[PDB]
Amino acid sequence: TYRNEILELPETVAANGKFGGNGVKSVVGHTYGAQVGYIADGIFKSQDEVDNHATQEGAAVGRIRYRDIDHNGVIDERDQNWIYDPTPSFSYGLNIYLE
Amino acid sequence: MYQSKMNVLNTEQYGRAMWQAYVNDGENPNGNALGYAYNWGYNADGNPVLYGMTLSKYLDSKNTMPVADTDWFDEITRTGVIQQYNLSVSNGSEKGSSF
Amino acid sequence: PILTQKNWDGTATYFQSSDEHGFSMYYKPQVGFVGDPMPFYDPVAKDFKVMYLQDYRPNPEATYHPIFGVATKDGATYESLGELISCGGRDEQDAAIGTGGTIYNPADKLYYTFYTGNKFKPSSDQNAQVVMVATSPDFKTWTKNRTFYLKGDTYGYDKNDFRDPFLFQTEDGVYHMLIATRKNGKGHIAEFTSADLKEWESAGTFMTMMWDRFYECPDVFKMGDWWYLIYSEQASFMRKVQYFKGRTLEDLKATTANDAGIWPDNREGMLDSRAFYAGKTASDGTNRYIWGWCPTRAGNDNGNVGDVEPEWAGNLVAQRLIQHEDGTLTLGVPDAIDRKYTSAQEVKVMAKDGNMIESGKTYTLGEGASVIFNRLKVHNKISFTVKTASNTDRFGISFVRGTDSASWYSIHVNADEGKANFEKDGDDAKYLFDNKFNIPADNEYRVTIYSDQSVCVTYINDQLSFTNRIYQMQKNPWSLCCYKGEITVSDVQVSTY
Amino acid sequence: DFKSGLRLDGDVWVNSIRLDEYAGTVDYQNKAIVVGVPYDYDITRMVVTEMNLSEGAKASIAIGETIDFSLPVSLTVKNGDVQMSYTITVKRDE
Ligand SMILES: [Mg+2]
């Protein structure tokens, strides 16, 4: 097992996010290649659920429901967080030899 | 042998998915303009149901491209053959050795 | 995942609602919109099997008129029977199908329907509209009788104006088909008589029209002791539903024979505003129900009513005809629709801006007094009683109203003009349209609003019927306002289901 | 394992049709069936005497019924689960 992290990076590189973060947040202090995105809390099942949930563009019955991180009542570019971590918890192997 | 055969929609499944998307969006499925003609109705609750479907035999006005059910993965895949033959001769002595 | 519930009951903030593709009370298919209704009563199943025209926003350029059927025992619950009459070919005469009629002949036990096929880009020598017939053995599958092609120019009528074949059977056993066509530049309802629905003889001109106007979907029937002809005006300025009264068929024919203009009542035969078109009636033997289509609005905006004419197609609306002792006809809420609402919702006041006073369940409002109630739901029934100081007051009910609502859509019952006006109040202050009715002499009004999703029908003391398409109405507060007189509202009840 | 069993073979060709006592020329590129009448024939009642499309192919038009061909008529030929559209037109010869 291992843990990977980036400590120092140029500001422009961190901003464009070619090494992680998708250009939204700096990858500094996180695993290399980590991606920042939205959170899908199921899908809408009724107009009542759609109305109860915070407003967002394209909201409709049967569409993906996105969690409001900041609880501002609107889904926008600020409702993103670290969700992808391309580092396994642990990798193992087993070999058995019988004669 | 190819084991990770991705399950893709056949002709009937593709037509059914097209009809479902059209009725979900509220447009007329018969307006797909892809040679598909759908016989469909409504249930007691008003949810659309698809009784049947038909297809134009030729996808083009020139009658040069007949419609058919094709398994693209099976068509492009096969059963691969692996052959290996190794022959090694070694001869070692305290005064000299070779392999 | 945990769902978050917002306290709808307690906040008067304006909310952006959304409508569903399918409607429960006022039937509308999830795909497309309903056009001109085709009411019909099945003598076998003892129910109502109303057909209609399917319309889509991206209509095909050549043949755009699918026909679907709706089956219902009453005016509340509806079911879809699927497509009945397939759209014609590009070059066929039935590419576009107009409004028609339907009868069930018991001699051969067959359902015969008559429709109007419209040729796509017709030539000069080709008739633009031709009446055709389809036959069904069980109202499930239909076959178009290709041997029948009735031409308007055969009997000297207009080639390009031959619409709405309404078929009905008299007591003598012969069938009559009425066509609202044009003859020598004059509007004429022409009658064709038959005994087997296969050979038709033109029995001259059944009626003439009124200042060379055009009517849509004529329907002649008898209600007890009077004969009524109900029709929809094709004129853009009017674009509403009118009717005539007559003691006998001969009396009705002699009525407005040559510009006589014998209106049935003081309201010129008005029944509903521009939000109700192609109203056609059908009877089950004890009750008379009329079906029409309330049009939609461009950009789902209530303010944009539509220049010249409103948008075609919309939502199916069913009302109950009411016959008085003087022969006047008024639209009433169906009993099934009225009884569908079961649960009751408590009402309360959220806004106090004017100088009204509150005394229990009774509220007194003066000039500039407006009181805002709680939010509505998808289905609502608001019933109350209003007593006015005099017979010249201007009270009103406003929907899409809230504390921060920039604009609201109001219906003002003006007693001085003796009518009601649907207008866009707030930051626009734009008057949309109106509808006339009879002001009661006791200054008493029984206001009942039945709202399904976006369509709303308001009944005033069983005399005024007013249909409106108000988007964003559901889950929004509604208000009562007064402008010139004094009003007293009581018995405010809200029912939902 | 992958086929949907929708019998896509569906021979929907049209060999020849005859209205009353007149044969029709069939063009497959534009899906047209042209029938000419000797500039005096009544073109409002024509009985579909014979037509042969293919094996297992069904058409909306029946045999023995009379049709009006004053305008082009759309004919749908269905075999199995596939369909094909033709336009039958009749011309009064000039
Ligand atoms: Mg947010």
Q: What's the CA gap between C230 and C281, in Å, rounded?
A: 8
Give Cα C277 distance to the centre of its chain. 5
Q: Which of D3, D30, D83 sits opposite B10 (nearest CB)?
A: D3
> Which chain B residues are within 8 Å of D3, Cβ to Cβ?
10, 69, 71
Q: What is the DSSP string of C145-211?
A: -TT--EEGGGGT--SS-EEEEEEEE-TTS-EEEEEEEEETTEEEEEEEEESSSSS-EEEEEEEE-ST
Which amino acid type is present at position C356? M
**Binding-site residues from annotation of C for Zn(2+):** 21, 379
> Which candidate, C358, C356, C381, places its Cα nearest to that of C366?
C356
Locus of tokens 């499309």 = D53
Spatial CB neighbours of C472, under 8 Å, sequence gap ≥ 6: C15, C16, C17, C302, C400
Spatial CB neighbours of C207, under 8 Å, sequence gap ≥ 6: C188, C189, C229, C252, C253, C256, C257
> Which chain A residues are within 8 Å of C3, Cβ to Cβ?
49, 52-53
Which H or E run contains C407? strand C407-414
> Which chain A residues are within 8 Å of C4, Cβ to Cβ?
52-54
Phi-psi region of C139 (alpha: psi -120 to 50; beta: other; left: phi over 0): left
Spatial CB neighbours of A95, under 8 Å, sequence gap ≥ 6: none
Q: What's the CA gap between C313 and C303, in Å, rounded?
A: 18
Q: What is the DSSP letter of C438?
A: P
- List the beta bridge partners of residue B96: B93
Min distance C1 CA to chain A CA atoms (Å): 5
How many H helices and E strands in chain B? Answer: 2, 4
Locus of tokens 């893709």 = B8
Ligand 1 mean position to C389 CA, how many Å?
Answer: 52
Output phi, psi for B19, to 5 deg.
Answer: -65, -40
> Which chain D residues are within 8 Å of B10, Cβ to Cβ?
2-4
> Which candidate, C446, C450, C447, C445, places its Cα nearest to that of C338?
C450
Q: What's the CA gap between C193 and C73, in Å, rounded?
A: 31
> Which chain B residues are within 8 Å of C79, Cβ to Cβ?
42, 44
D70 contacts chain C (CB < 8 A): yes
Which H or E run contains C254? helix C249-254
Q: What's the CA gap between C54 and C36, in Å, rounded?
A: 9
Q: What's the CA gap between C176 and C163, in Å, rounded?
A: 15
Q: What's the CA gap between C396 and C466, in Å, rounded?
A: 13
Contact C72, C50 (CB under 8 A): yes
> Which candidate, C260, C256, C262, C216, places its Cα nearest to that of C239?
C216
* Residue A43 exposure: Cα atoms within 13 Å on the Cβ side: 6
Spatial CB neighbours of D69, under 8 Å, sequence gap ≥ 6: D19, D35, D43, D44, D46, D88, D89, D90
- List the beta bridge partners of residue C315: C294
> Which candidate, C74, C24, C48, C37, places its Cα nearest to that of C139?
C48
**How buried is residue C33: exposed, middle or buried, by Cβ count under 10 Å (0-12/13-18/19+)?**
buried
Ligand 1 mean position to D56 CA, how many Å?
Answer: 61
Contact C217, C318 (CB under 8 A): no
Radius of gyration of chain A (CA): 19
Percentages of chain A per state (helix, strand, coil), in multiples of 5: 10, 15, 70
Which H or E run contains D34? strand D32-37
> Which candidate, C36, C475, C12, places its Cα nearest to that of C277?
C36
Locus of tokens 């609005």 = C297
- List the beta bridge partners of residue C316: C293
Strands B48-56 and D82-92: parallel
A touches D, CB cut-off 8 Å, minimum 3 pairs: no
Q: What's the CA gap between B84 and B4, in Å, rounded?
A: 25
Percentages of chain B per state (helix, strand, coil), in multiples of 5: 25, 25, 50
Which amino acid type is present at position C204? G
> Which candidate, C52, C170, C156, C34, places its Cα nearest to that of C100?
C52
Q: Which of A43, A44, A48, A51 to mutate to test the interface with C (most CBs of C within 10 A)?
A: A51
For chain C, list the contacting chains (3+ Cβ pairs, <8 Å): A, B, D
Polymer length of chain C: 497
- Does D68 sit within 8 Å of C147, measured CB to CB? yes
Which amino acid type is present at position C40? F
Contact C416, C432 (CB under 8 A): no
Locus of tokens 């759309």 = D74
CB count in 10 Å sphere of residue C142:
17
Spatial CB neighbours of C383, under 8 Å, sequence gap ≥ 6: C446, C447, C448, C449, C491, C492, C493, C495
Q: What's the CA gap between B28 and C196, in Å, rounded?
A: 38
Q: What is the DSSP letter of C64?
A: -
C33-338 CATH: 2.115.10.20
Chain breaks in chain A (C to N over 2.5 A) after: none
Three-state SS for A88?
coil
Q: What's the CA gap between C449 and C337, in Å, rounded?
A: 12
Ligand 1 mean position to C1 CA, how many Å?
Answer: 17
- Does C5 sit within 8 Å of A41, measured CB to CB? no
